[PDB]
Amino acid sequence: IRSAEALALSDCRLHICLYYRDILVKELTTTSPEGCRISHGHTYDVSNLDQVLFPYPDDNGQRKNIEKLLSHLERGLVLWMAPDGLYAKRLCQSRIYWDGPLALCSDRPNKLERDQTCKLFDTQQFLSELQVFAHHGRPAPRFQVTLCFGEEFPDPQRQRKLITAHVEPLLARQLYYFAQQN
């Protein structure tokens, strides 16, 4: 019905944040409709997906372990927004834990199967959550995906998980922002 809502619903862009031990080390908005791949090291092939590369870690302290983890993130993780919603495909050797709107607490821990497409966010469910928000004012609809690479919990020797990501479809962010203006 509203043409601004149609635009948001049409948008395939993802907002992505990468953390090394709970420190922001990278933040971007994807531009490609085909999706994006998060990985370690340049790949010299043809691909219509955005290449999000893990940045070089800081020299101090946990560098050796992060590097080992990065070596299991070479092939990386493919993410893309369909009209349907947000999809994920793990291609890497490193295990990938996720939390998000399609996840349960009973289902936890939530792991991405290698080479298997998993759906992390669904637009119809989101629109339903968005309706509940519009009527009652709570709760905020859920649309953030959380990813940890390699670790289900922070190591005994370390306070934080080594590498974490945050993914938001801009579609949800903008629709929620709209709903807040009223």
Binding site for Cl ion (CB under 5 A): 39, 41, 43, 74-75, 92-93
Q: Which is nearer to Cl ion, 50 or 129 (CB)?
A: 50
- CB–CB of 98/112 below 8 Å? yes
Rounded Cα gap, residues 144 and 177, in angstroms: 14
Give kind and range of the element (H or E) at residue 5. Answer: helix 3-10
Please, what is the minimum distance in Å from the beta carbon of residue 7 to Cl ion? 24
Please, what is the minimum distance in Å from the beta carbon of residue 75 to Cl ion? 4
Q: In sequence order, which residues have a C-beta less than 8 Å from that of residue 35 and are 6 or more positions away? A: 12, 14, 49, 50, 78, 79, 80, 81, 87
Please, what is the minimum distance in Å from the beta carbon of residue 142 to Cl ion? 30
Q: In sequence order, which residues have a C-beta less than 8 Å from that of residue 56 and are 6 or more positions away? A: none
Q: Which is nearer to Cl ion, 37 or 126 (CB)?
A: 37
60's tokens = 């101090």
Please, what is the minimum distance in Å from the beta carbon of residue 166 to Cl ion? 21
Please, what is the minimum distance in Å from the beta carbon of residue 92 to Cl ion? 4
Rounded Cα gap, residues 139 and 33, in angstroms: 30
